[PDB]
Structure formats: C-alpha cells, structure tokens
C-alpha cells in the first residue's frame, strides 16, 4: 500500500513540476505513484541531485487509475499477421530483395503487428542484433501482456557475457543502434540527453554500445509518450520531432502556417547541473497527428554517407538522429540539405535513400487532413456505449475492426461494405502501381551488370545512378508507408508514376548504350 | 480541475477517518475527490461541525479512477425483460393474484432487471407511490446511464406541489416508505440514523414523508455500499444487516460459527453531537455473500400486525426495518420472536407473512455455499483476457451470459450446454412444484367462501387459517427467491412439498366440514 | 482379449439358436461376445441346464462392432428440456392436476 | 492464440524459403552468363558443388509440408545455410565473370 509524500517539499526545488502538476488534472495524484524519492529528499540540494530517486516507467503505473485505456492498449490483434516478411509475392514488396540489395532490410522486413510487441520485435528481428536475442521459446510470440510487463521477461540473450554487436546466425545483420530505441520505448527518458548528444548526465547516447543499452530497456510505448505525467496534458517526448517542429521552426503542419499556430508545440527543457539536458513538447491541443508522428515518420536513425563526397556519417553525427519532416516531393531536397544518403545499391552502385513508414508526412494535405481529421479518428476512436462512460480506445489498429466509429459516423451515406470497398479501390490501385514500379526498377537494375560487362562508360552509368535515386525514392516511399495509398491516394499515384517514368528513362539510356557497344 | 486539500488538518478532528484512510489503498486519494469542505474547515471545532461540508454520493466520483468497474456495472442487460408482471401464466407465479389477495403486491410485481434501474423502478412501480412518478416518456425506460446519473433526470412527478402519498391512478397502491430506499440507494447515508430511528441529527427516518424523501434521492447502488471510500476495504452499510449479524449476535453465517468467525463483520459507529448516529460493518474478507445480503434477503420494510393480538405495527416501530436472517424452516419462529405478520388474506382472512427475495438465506447450507463459493463467483466473475489487467466484472447478472467464467472454470467436466442443462433440470423441477403448490393453495382458498356460506364454524376456519400461514410461507419463499431452486434445490423441494402437504390438509378439513353442514 | 468358443458344440443342444445364428448376418459372430458358458458346457445335458451361463445385456456388447449406431443412440439432446412438468401453463396440460386428480400422475 | 503461434512460425519460415529461392535463382541465372563469358569449368564445378548444398537446404522445406512448424529452429538454420551457399556461389561466379571481362 502506497503512502503519500508531501509534494510541497519537492516543489521547493522543482518549480517546473510545481507549475505543471498543481494546474492540471493530476493535481491530486501523489508523487509516490511514480517516484520513490525518500533518500533523494534526504540528500539533495537545490542544485545537486544527491541520491537518485526511482522513477517508475512501467505502464502499470497508469493502469491502476486508467484500466480501460491500458487494457485497450495491450490487446493483441491476432488478425495482424505476425512475422510476415514483406519481400514475398503475397505481401507489400514482391521484388524487395532485388531493389533493396545492399541494405540491412534485405535480411528481414516484416509487416507491423500490435503495439504491445514493438520493443521485443525490434530486439528479435533478423536485421537488428545479429540474432543475439530471441523469445524464450516460440510460444512466447503470443504474449502481449508479458512483453508489456517487460521485454526481458519474454526474451533471452545468446551471450550475456559479451556486449558487442555481432552475428550469431549467418543471415542476420547488426543494424540496431541506440537511436532506434526512441521509437520503441522511453524507459531511458531520464538517461538520454536531447538528440542523443554526449552529455555528462546521460548514461546513454547515440554512441553507446547498443547491446548494453538494450538490456536496460523493458517497456513498449510508455503511456507518458503522449501524456505528461505531471499535468496529464497532451505532449510529445521524441527529440527528433521536437527538433524538426520547434528548433528548425518547421511547425507542426509545415504546409499550413495557420493550423501550425492553432495546433502548435511548446518546448519545455529540463536541466542537469544547470545545463540543458532533456526536453518535451507540450501540445496546444490533444493532436494525435503530432503524437503519432513521434514514430510514424521517415527518419535517420542510422549511419550513412554524404552525397557530396561519399564520406561516412557515423552515429556520433547529429544527422544520425534526424526527422526529415518532408513529404515525398520535398524529401530529396531535405536529404540534400543535410548532405546524406543511406546506402549504395549492391548491383547498380547508386547512392540511395532508405525510406521508413512516412505516414505523418504522407497524411499532410490529404482530403482527410484538410478537413481536420486526425490519426486517432480512424485508428483509436471513442468507444460507443449504449450505457457507459465514454473513453478513447487505445487499441491503435486498422479501422476495419471498428468501422462504425472510425468511418461511418462521418460517412452516413455509406454501409460498412461500401466504405470497405472504397478503401480497397484505393489500395488495389496503389498496389498495382507499386508492383509496376518494382517491375521497371528491376528491369533497370538488371541492365547494370549487362552495361558494365558491355563496357558502357562510367558517365552513362552515373547518369543511370542519378535516375535510380529518384526511381527508388518515388517507389519505396509507398512500400514503406503502411496505408497502401489510402492516406493520400493522389500523391501515391503521382509519385509511383514518377518512379516508373524515371526507371523507363534509365532503361532506355542503358539499352541504347549497350546497343552502341555491340554495334 | 480538482485542487488537493490538506488531509492532515482534517485528521486533527477525524481520527477514525485517519485510521482508515492512512492504512488502506486509498491513502493517496485526496479528500477533494469526494468532499467540498472549505467552509467546514474554516468554521468547525472538534466539538461543532460549523458549516456542513458537501459529500459526493454520485458513482462518477469513483468512475474517474475505476472506469472498468463502473462501465461493467452500468451496462443494461436487454435480455432481462423489463416491466414483466410475475402474476401471468408465462412468468413466476401464475396464480399470484389469488394467493396474494389483500397485499399491495397484487397491484404490480415485475421480474427484476439490471441494477442501473433499481431506484427508478422502485419509484415507478404501480404498488409504490400511487402512480405519482413516471419516466418522462416511454422512451426513457432504456436509459440506464441516465438513471445512474440520477433518477430525477429521467422521471417526472405528477404533482410537485404536494407531498402526500395518494393514488393518481385507480389500480395503484402507496406501499413505499422510507425503509425501502435503503435497498435502492445510500445517497442518504449521512442523513439517516441507524435503523431509521428518530435522531436530532437525521433529516430522514422511518416516519418521514416518503414522497419528500424520494425527491432528495438520485443514485442507485452507490459504489460505496460494498467498498469503504476511505480504506477502500470491503464493507456493508445496510443497517438491518449490521443489526442481524452484529447487534443480535447471529453472525455472518448463522449455521456455521467457524465461517462466521473467519468471515466476520466489525461494526464501526460514527457520532453526531457525541451521540451514536450511523454505523458500517467492515468485513474480514471481500465476501460477496454478505455484500449482496444487504438487499437480497427477506425483510420487513413496512408496517404490519402482531400475531399475538392483531394490533397494528407502524413505521415508527423498530420491527418496520428488520432482517429476519433466517432460512425458510426458521422463518416462522423468527416472525414469532418479533410477534409480526404482514397482511390478512382478502378471501381466507388468514394472518400471512409476505416474503421477498431471500437469496442469501436460501444459499446457506447449499452445496456451493458449503464449498466456499459466493454470489460473485457466479454473478460477478473476474474477467478473462488474452492480454490485459484482470478486474472483477460488476455486471451482476445471470451466469448464462458468462458461463466460461461463472461455471466452467470450476466444472471442467462440462460443456456450456451441459451446465445449462443442469440449471434447467433444477429450475424446471422447482417451477413444477411451485405451480402445484399454487394449484393446492388456490383450491384451499376457494373453499373458504364455500365453507363460510355453508355455516362452517369459526373454530374450523381458524384451524384452516393456521394451515394457510404455513402453506403460504413454504410456497411464497420460492416465487420470491429468484433462482427458481438453483441456489438450494433440495431445500426448495422439501419446502414446496411441505406447502402442498399443508394445503392438502386444509382442503380435507374444509371439505369435511362443508360436507357435514350439508348432511 | 476374447477367445472364441466352439459354437458347433452349443448347437448340439441349442437347435433354435443354430437355425437363427447360422443363417443370419451374425453367423461369424462368436458366442463369446455375449455369453460366458465355460462351466455351463461342462455341466449341461440336453435336458438339464447345469451351471447357468452368463449373458451380457450391456449395450457395449454391440458397440464393439457397431460404434456408429451406439454413439448416435447415446447422444443426449440438450434441447429436450429435462424434468419439465406437464401440469404447468407453459407445457402440454395446463389443467392436468384438476383433471387427473385421484391418479398417481 | 494457438493459431497465431502456428502462423508466426509458418510466416517466418516461408519468408526464408522465398529469400532462399531469390538467391538460388540469382545464382542459377549467372551460369549462362559465366558460360558465355568463358569462365573456366573449374569455377563452374566449384559453383555446381555449392548448388548441391544451396538446393538441399532450401528444397527440404518446400518439400516438407509444415512450412517449418514441425521443427522451426531446424528450418531456420537450414534456410540460412541455403542462402549462405547461394551467396558464396554468386560471389564466385560474379568475380569470375568480371575477370573475364577485364
Ligand atoms: C532540493 C533540495 C530538492 C528536493 C526537496 C527534491 N529534489 Fe528532486 N532533484 C533535485 C535536483 C537538484 C535534481 C537534479 C536535476 C535538477 O533539476 O538539477 C533532482 C532530480 C529529480 C528527478 C530526476 C531524477 C533522474 O533520474 O534524473 C526526479 C524524478 C526528482 N528529482 C523527484 C523529486 C520528488 C518526487 C521530490 C519530493 C519527494 C523531490 N525530487 C525533492 C532537487 C530536489
Ligand atoms: C490515480 C491515482 C491516477 C494515476 C496513477 C494516474 N492518473 Fe491520469 N488521471 C487521474 C484522474 C483523477 C484524472 C482526472 C479525470 C477527469 O476527467 O477529471 C486523470 C486524468 C488523465 C488524463 C486526461 C487529462 C486531460 O484530459 O486533461 C490523461 C491523459 C491521464 N490521466 C493519463 C495518465 C497517465 C499516462 C498515467 C501514468 C503515467 C496516469 N494518468 C496516472 C488519475 C490517475
Ligand atoms: C521512429 C522514427 C522509429 C525509429 C527510429 C525506428 N523505428 Fe522501427 N518502426 C517504427 C514504426 C512506426 C514501425 C511500424 C510501421 C512499419 O512500417 O513497420 C516500426 C516497425 C519496426 C519493426 C517491425 C516491422 C519489421 O520491419 O520487421 C522492427 C523489427 C523495427 N521497427 C526495428 C527497428 C530497428 C532495428 C531500428 C533502428 C535501426 C528501428 N526500428 C528504428 C518506428 C521507428
Ligand atoms: C500435449 C500432448 C501437446 C499437444 C497436443 C501440443 N503441444 Fe505444443 N507443446 C507441448 C509441450 C510440452 C511443449 C514444450 C513446452 C515447454 O515450454 O517446454 C510444446 C511446445 C509448443 C511450441 C513452442 C515450440 C518451440 O519450438 O519453442 C508451440 C508454438 C506449440 N507447442 C504449439 C502447439 C500447437 C499449435 C499445437 C496443436 C497443433 C500443439 N502445440 C500441440 C505440448 C503439446
Ligand atoms: C499517443 C500515441 C498515446 C499513447 C502512447 C497513450 N495515449 Fe492515452 N490518449 C491518446 C489520445 C489521442 C487521447 C484522446 C485525446 C482526445 O481528447 O481526443 C487519449 C486519451 C487518454 C485519456 C483520457 C480519457 C479518454 O479519452 O479515454 C486517458 C486517461 C489516457 N489516454 C490514458 C492512457 C494510458 C493509461 C496510456 C498507456 C496505456 C495511454 N493513454 C497511452 C493518445 C495516447
Ligand atoms: C481515416 C480517415 C484515417 C486517418 C485520419 C488515418 N488513417 Fe491510417 N489507415 C487508414 C486506412 C483505411 C488504412 C488501411 C487499413 C486497412 O485495413 O486496409 C490505414 C492504414 C494505416 C496503417 C497500417 C495499418 C495496418 O495495415 O494494420 C498505419 C500504421 C496507419 N494507417 C497509421 C496512421 C497514422 C500514424 C495516421 C495519422 C498521421 C493515420 N494513419 C491517419 C485510415 C486512416
Ligand atoms: C476539527 C476542527 C475539524 C476539522 C479540521 C475538520 N472537521 Fe469535518 N467535522 C467536524 C465535526 C465536529 C463534525 C460533525 C460530526 C462529528 O464528528 O461530530 C464534522 C463532520 C464532517 C463530515 C460529515 C458531514 C455530514 O454531512 O454529516 C465530513 C464529510 C467532514 N467533516 C469532512 C472533513 C474534511 C474532508 C476535512 C478536511 C478538509 C474536515 N472535515 C476537517 C470537525 C472537523
Ligand atoms: C483515483 C483518484 C481514485 C478515486 C477517485 C477512487 N479510487 Fe479506488 N483506488 C485507487 C487506487 C490508486 C487504488 C489501489 C489500486 C491497487 O491495486 O493498488 C484503489 C483501490 C480501490 C479498491 C481495491 C481496494 C483493495 O483491494 O483493498 C476498491 C474496492 C476501490 N478502490 C473502490 C473505490 C470506490 C468505491 C470509489 C468511489 C467512492 C473509489 N475507489 C475512488 C484510486 C481511486
Ligand atoms: C432490501 C432488503 C430491500 C428493501 C427494503 C426493498 N427492496 Fe425492492 N428489491 C430488492 C431486491 C434485492 C430486488 C430484486 C429481486 C426481486 O425479487 O425483484 C428488489 C426489486 C424491486 C422492484 C422490481 C421488481 C418488482 O417487484 O416490480 C421494485 C419495483 C421494488 N423492489 C420496490 C420496492 C418497494 C416499493 C419497497 C418498499 C415497500 C422495496 N422495494 C423494499 C430489495 C429491497
Ligand atoms: C419517425 C417518422 C418515427 C418512426 C418511424 C418511429 N418513431 Fe418512435 N417516436 C417518434 C417521435 C417524434 C416521438 C415523440 C418523441 C418525443 O420525445 O416527443 C416518438 C415516440 C416513441 C416512444 C415514446 C412513446 C411515448 O408514448 O412516450 C417509443 C417507445 C418509440 N417512439 C419507439 C419506436 C419504435 C419501437 C419504432 C419502430 C416500431 C418507432 N418508435 C417508430 C418518431 C418515430
Ligand atoms: C457490492 C454489491 C458491490 C458494489 C455496489 C460495488 N462493488 Fe466493486 N467489488 C465488489 C466485489 C465482490 C469485488 C471483488 C472483491 C474480490 O477481491 O473478490 C469488487 C472489486 C472492486 C475493485 C477491485 C479491482 C477489481 O477486482 O476489479 C474496484 C476498483 C471496485 N470493485 C470498484 C467499484 C466501483 C467503482 C463501484 C461502483 C460502480 C463498485 N465497485 C460497486 C463488490 C461491489
Ligand atoms: C453459482 C454456483 C451461483 C452462486 C454462488 C449464486 N447464484 Fe444466483 N443464480 C445462479 C443461477 C444458475 C441462477 C439462475 C440463472 C438463470 O439464468 O437461470 C441464479 C439466479 C439468481 C438471480 C435471478 C437472476 C435472473 O433471473 O436474471 C438473483 C437475483 C441471484 N441469483 C442472486 C444471487 C445472490 C444474491 C447470491 C449470493 C447469496 C447468489 N445468487 C449465489 C447461480 C449462482
Ligand atoms: C447340451 C449338452 C448343451 C450344450 C452343449 C450347451 N447348452 Fe446351453 N443350455 C442347455 C440347457 C438344457 C439349457 C436350459 C434351457 C433349455 O433350453 O432347456 C441351456 C441354457 C442356455 C442359456 C440360457 C441361460 C439362461 O439364463 O436362461 C444360454 C445363454 C446358453 N445355454 C448358451 C450356451 C452356449 C453359448 C453354449 C456353447 C458354449 C451352450 N449353451 C452349450 C443345454 C446345452
Ligand atoms: C462384431 C464381432 C459384432 C458384434 C459383437 C455384433 N455385431 Fe451386429 N453385425 C456384425 C457384422 C459383421 C454384420 C454384417 C454387416 C453386413 O452388412 O454384412 C452385423 C450385422 C448387424 C445388423 C444388420 C443385420 C441385417 O441387416 O440383417 C444388426 C441390426 C446388428 N448387427 C445388430 C447387433 C446388435 C444389436 C449387437 C449386440 C447384441 C450386435 N450386432 C453385435 C458384427 C457384430
Ligand atoms: O521542475 S523541474 O524543472 O525540476
Ligand atoms: O526500422 S523501423 O523504422 O521500421
Ligand atoms: O473520524 S471520524 O469518526 O470523525
Ligand atoms: O478532543 S475533543 O474533545 O476536542
Ligand atoms: O419490494 S422489493 O423487496 O422487491
Ligand atoms: O435353441 S434354443 O431353443 O435352445
Ligand atoms: O433331445 S433331447 O431329448 O436329448
Ligand atoms: Ca530513412
Ligand atoms: Ca417480508
């Protein structure tokens, strides 16, 4: 049984917490719910921490008073097929291996599944830790509640005695680095300086041994990623997002200055030894577009190379933790602005970008976004009850499971079948264009070895490599993006037609050059 | 947004609250969640209340931190057919009008429905307030959430300008009195002295104008009826139950002194002006048998008559608020102990008891009770979740809706259909004996006018009236009790056969006496 | 495990059984499936039973070779409501008690 | 939940079967290129010995009907071996072809 502490004692030294806690809807929620600070209070001074208080990061710290939201969050959607590789003829990218050759995603790239599994799935995917981590056995793959209780309750480490990234099975990679973890957990929120910069007060940073960092982390998608635990108000905690919206002044809606002002973000900074250490972004409104954009964006969270000179850009560089905050048609400029690319294609040698799940940047400017609809309206709607206290579902999943609330309340002109049909028209059309984009990319790729062995000039090969960058960008955005065009069907169509055009241009260039060598 | 108050200051005067609050699982729950005491604190001394603080009795006061339990409670079971009269051939008591003639239940006695409706249903039933209260319209009968928010949000009063009990429609009765409300609400918990005795500090008592009392009451089945709001620990608040178990020393399980000691009750008394005023009964364990026995018992909550001399026993008498706390075979002795009966039969003239829903007293000594099973195991089971934090369902309903949790976890040998079949075997057999008991009671009753008109002696009519008491008791227990025998099938059988035996004895006596008058 | 008996010896006395068994579709079904007659055969004459043989009356004696029929027979129809008294308003004979008064039913 | 556990294994194993086929096909398609480039029989025979293993450690799992369920760790180890063998052969043939061109 918890015993309350005198918060006034804390407030003497913690004035930002005072200002947040006393005003919001957690004004009556005692510190003891989330902190054990007895020895801290005995030893702290106004500028020195003394003994470090314990802070609970487990989701159960919130489930005691918010069981409905917690239970809705932890539910496992068994229809979200697990461990399903995307580089197969029946999934999102049938020609992914040929197109991505040279990148670590070639080792494994599965479809997403329920949020409860994000941290464990990050740990066990074949591309991340060389196969070092596994579930304790194959039964544990079902255990969402166990994963939420903590990753290390359901996983095993092949070698607890070493901390290096290395392959434990042959067809694995070691792509994981500490930046990844910021989109899986915020257990490290008090141990990681803003952006992962080096900092005397930070236990972990971009340059940490990721295997050691991994062992310290337990919980997926902490509840406080979207809700300040002190004010209970809406926020983001993801450093990369704050950096794009606030530091770089791009705004919460880069295409809409007015909506950016109405639905903006305020950066709040916390210090260690009176030096800036960490930050949060308080939202003007409970805006799920921005909450979900903590993770559902295109980013750098990895080393890469410079476009200018080809030199390595390591984890120590700020560019290794970067939100581009740019739509598909602005992305190339955004990558040029930081002078960055991800990998060289194994076959063509082209410098290429690697795109990841750009849902937020795709949603901008779409019909639903322009009409003020947000991610939560379709993916975590209010529950409808004949007799009950309404709450917001936290089971972030496809609207197909809750069409009445997610779609039909707005679209009164439609039955469930009609709304599903409309979704499928868009996904079927977009997927057809993704498959055609891959056909043309693959045709271009396969000409590179033919051209090389025919003695085609480097000048021509480099021209084709520049086209490959665009052909790739304007295709991969859409295999990376999870809606198969639904979030912005006209943009997907325009982009995928651009991909095909670029590949066709490269195919013609290489075919002509090969034929001239033969003649 | 609530602002916390200094609970330590309250504790300078409220030492019993201190001892309960600081120790239990609400030690961190600030008083401002349920009390507005600003002016009270300014004006009170340890010996004078000063300004009366406000105390919240609404269930929303608990729903803020316990939404899952609140929503499970407020759910309406549409399959529990509403306003369904029991005196019909397709319900529980086909010959009820003949058998109950002379009692207010003849005006209306419907089947129970969901707990959300208990207070509104009490207010609108034809036997209670002469038809004074109605739902605002016939649509409002569906609105469980509205009823929980408050009775007067969904009901109308035919005459707000008068406070007398009278008939507003011809075929209604005015049986309601202040004792009834104790089993519908505890909004009056700080305004009602223990047992409803007269008390300087009580706004309301057994002798109040019930229409005035009604207007002051809003919420059904307050959450704190089973849970102390200060300690969060298990309790009862119903005066009649505390009186039977503690004051009269009967124990929580009158037939089991060991279980009574292990699962006992501690009476806690609160004073006004340094005189005892109200009481609660803290339970040793979270024993739903005793929680549910606050209402699901046979009781007096009405005026009646003395068995000794036939004189009136009015609402002013302590006997007007009484829990007999006796099984069917001990009831007659229990009623003799307090020298009480309810009504005289309109046709036979017999002094008769009126029985109401004796579920708790029926459950004693049954196979499930003897095996440590309690009401909640079958009617409020723990929820089963593939992934989730377990909580206790508060939707207190038939186990038919949740057979996996209510029955089949214990009865692994059975399918759902087999368990339902076992329930129905008992209910069918018991109902058949109820119907035969009514057949014989009706045969006996119909002989009374024949006997009177034939000049049969008063001595013979009185012997038959004595048998009518028993014939009635041993039948009505089982139309009153809601399980149709399931809670104690052997007791139902033994009792119903006793009813038939008694009726047969009276029929023989009367037929012989009539025949002798004709000869 | 059952061991077959010499049915021809039984038939030396049991001519009606012979005429029925040898002709029908149980001609290959040995007597040991349903009778234990060891001591009977040792002690009987055509005119004296001797020791009484055991005859199986359990339905399992047939279920061994006719499981489909046995299982279809033993199935419980849960929809056939059990212990449901007919002298009730919702069953077959609402006024049965008045009409049958004097009878055990 | 039990169906989900089956599908996790089948989906993972099938993904590795598809990748094993991708790499086998890539190797196979280099044989005519190598032949017509004049790559030596010595190199072609080295690649043929690798083909035996690349094939065995793939085809076992298209032949076997459980899509890995009957022995998920063995399927994983075998299919990773298939991919490794194909990759070794692809590198051998690519290098040899490139040396013929130079
Ligand atoms: C002044 C003497 C203090 C009192 C009283 C309390 N805290 Fe404190 N705390 C203090 C300092 C100087 C620091 C270092 C950061 C800074 O602001 O300079 C802290 C740190 C914390 C933290 C962060 C711990 C971490 O892991 O980084 C927490 C969660 C914290 N303090 C909580 C806290 C509570 C709940 C208190 C009342 C019981 C409290 N502190 C008292 C200075 C002082
Ligand atoms: C009980 C002691 C609580 C704990 C532990 C947590 N919260 Fe809470 N929360 C609590 C109350 C009484 C309220 C106010 C309810 C009301 O509607 O008045 C809240 C409110 C929230 C909200 C809504 C805030 C708003 O709309 O402005 C959120 C988003 C919230 N709480 C989240 C939350 C999280 C993430 C917690 C764990 C870190 C958590 N709460 C703990 C009671 C309690
Ligand atoms: C936030 C900007 C992210 C960073 C940094 C990383 N990941 Fe991620 N990941 C993110 C989202 C929003 C999703 C779901 C949508 C989707 O397209 O899958 C994911 C998914 C994964 C998965 C599961 C799917 C899969 O590819 O197998 C894994 C295994 C995963 N992510 C691993 C991973 C690694 C190793 C990272 C650093 C190199 C990494 N993620 C960063 C959001 C973000
Ligand atoms: C009892 C006779 C079993 C039957 C029938 C099935 N399973 Fe099983 N399974 C059983 C045991 C004793 C174990 C090992 C348990 C342990 O923790 O030591 C298992 C294992 C599994 C696993 C994990 C396999 C792994 O390689 O780690 C899975 C995914 C599994 N079982 C699923 C499963 C399914 C889907 C079944 C029906 C087709 C099934 N099992 C049958 C016991 C028994
Ligand atoms: C961002 C991805 C979120 C995470 C992680 C959590 N919640 Fe949430 N919550 C989210 C949104 C968009 C909303 C609705 C805001 C609106 O007003 O439209 C909510 C709401 C809450 C509330 C308020 C009551 C309600 O509407 O249900 C509570 C109490 C709350 N959320 C709690 C909660 C808990 C306990 C979480 C961890 C299990 C949790 N939230 C995560 C967005 C996000
Ligand atoms: C309704 C107008 C939507 C809004 C607003 C957002 N999304 Fe969406 N999303 C939508 C549909 C119809 C679909 C396809 C669902 C299907 O079953 O076909 C999606 C898909 C996703 C996915 C993949 C879900 C899955 O396949 O299981 C993700 C990860 C997703 N959407 C995220 C997302 C985010 C972060 C949004 C705000 C920026 C967002 N969506 C808005 C419908 C709608
Ligand atoms: C002594 C100076 C007191 C302080 C400080 C507080 N209260 Fe009090 N309270 C006091 C008295 C003498 C009485 C009359 C009852 C009695 O014990 O003799 C009360 C009564 C209450 C009640 C009941 C009101 C009712 O309707 O009957 C409540 C709910 C109550 N008090 C709450 C309360 C709270 C929450 C306080 C701190 C903010 C508090 N009281 C201070 C004496 C004193
Ligand atoms: C949030 C500010 C709360 C309000 C308002 C109420 N309760 Fe509560 N309750 C709260 C917490 C944080 C806990 C402890 C949770 C844990 O398991 O640690 C509780 C506990 C209860 C319990 C369980 C008590 C026990 O098992 O000993 C009950 C029965 C309970 N609460 C009931 C309850 C009622 C009826 C309320 C309205 C009068 C109520 N609670 C308010 C948080 C909060
Ligand atoms: C607790 C000991 C009770 C007292 C005192 C009163 N009632 Fe009641 N009532 C109680 C229970 C447990 C039930 C449900 C079980 C059942 O057999 O119905 C009820 C039900 C009602 C109903 C609905 C059913 C009906 O008869 O129409 C009404 C209208 C009702 N009760 C009214 C009522 C009146 C008028 C009372 C005082 C004269 C009264 N109740 C007292 C528990 C208790
Ligand atoms: C629109 C053309 C309607 C159709 C078709 C049905 N109902 Fe209706 N109903 C309607 C109105 C405008 C009103 C009065 C509303 C008010 O608040 O003034 C009603 C009323 C009812 C009621 C209340 C009856 C009463 O006497 O108080 C009930 C129970 C009701 N309606 C139910 C109902 C059902 C079951 C219908 C289909 C058979 C139905 N209504 C049709 C509007 C219309
Ligand atoms: C008596 C008829 C009850 C009323 C009225 C309410 N609850 Fe209850 N609650 C009840 C029982 C028998 C139990 C289980 C005790 C056990 O341990 O077996 C509970 C439990 C709770 C809890 C604890 C968490 C859980 O088990 O779900 C809470 C927080 C709780 N109940 C809250 C609650 C609220 C908010 C109510 C009003 C809507 C409420 N309870 C009414 C019995 C009774
Ligand atoms: C399981 C072993 C049970 C225990 C313990 C209790 N009851 Fe029960 N009850 C049980 C059954 C199978 C039935 C019949 C349900 C059906 O649908 O046929 C009942 C019935 C009730 C009812 C009437 C419910 C209705 O008809 O909707 C009430 C009011 C009821 N039971 C209350 C009750 C109480 C108060 C108990 C503890 C003293 C109790 N029951 C124990 C199964 C079980
Ligand atoms: C003549 C020497 C006999 C031989 C060889 C067998 N049985 Fe017999 N059996 C015999 C007699 C005289 C009687 C009495 C009935 C009669 O026909 O007069 C019987 C009786 C039986 C019975 C019936 C026993 C009963 O409970 O009534 C059976 C089932 C029976 N016999 C079976 C039987 C079998 C299976 C034999 C071969 C192993 C057999 N008998 C030999 C005379 C003679
Ligand atoms: C196996 C050793 C058997 C035992 C023991 C019983 N019966 Fe049988 N029966 C058996 C066979 C091989 C056949 C013939 C199947 C065919 O179609 O050729 C039968 C046949 C029957 C029939 C059908 C007879 C007809 O259509 O003429 C019936 C009705 C029958 N058997 C019933 C039966 C009963 C009731 C048994 C227990 C006393 C029994 N059989 C035993 C094989 C075996
Ligand atoms: O209040 S915080 O900034 O210590
Ligand atoms: O690797 S994550 O970004 O899907
Ligand atoms: O603590 S109470 O008894 O005033
Ligand atoms: O303790 S009281 O008497 O002030
Ligand atoms: O009148 S109540 O007791 O059913
Ligand atoms: O064959 S019988 O009749 O003994
Ligand atoms: O045939 S008999 O009589 O032995
Ligand atoms: Ca990227
Ligand atoms: Ca009574």
Swiss-Prot record, chain D:
Binding site for heme 8: 70
Post-translational modification: Besides, it may lower the pKa of the Tyr hydroxyl group.
Entry coiled-coil feature ranges: none
Subcellular location, record wording: Periplasm
Subunit structure: Homohexamer. Dimer of trimers.
Family designation: Belongs to the cytochrome c-552 family.
Role description: Catalyzes the reduction of nitrite to ammonia, consuming six electrons in the process. Has very low activity toward hydroxylamine. Has even lower activity toward sulfite. Sulfite reductase activity is maximal at neutral pH.
Protein name as catalogued: Cytochrome c-552
UniProt organism field: Thioalkalivibrio nitratireducens (strain DSM 14787 / UNIQEM 213 / ALEN2)
Taxonomic placement: Bacteria, Pseudomonadati, Pseudomonadota, Gammaproteobacteria, Chromatiales
Gene, per the UniProt record: nir
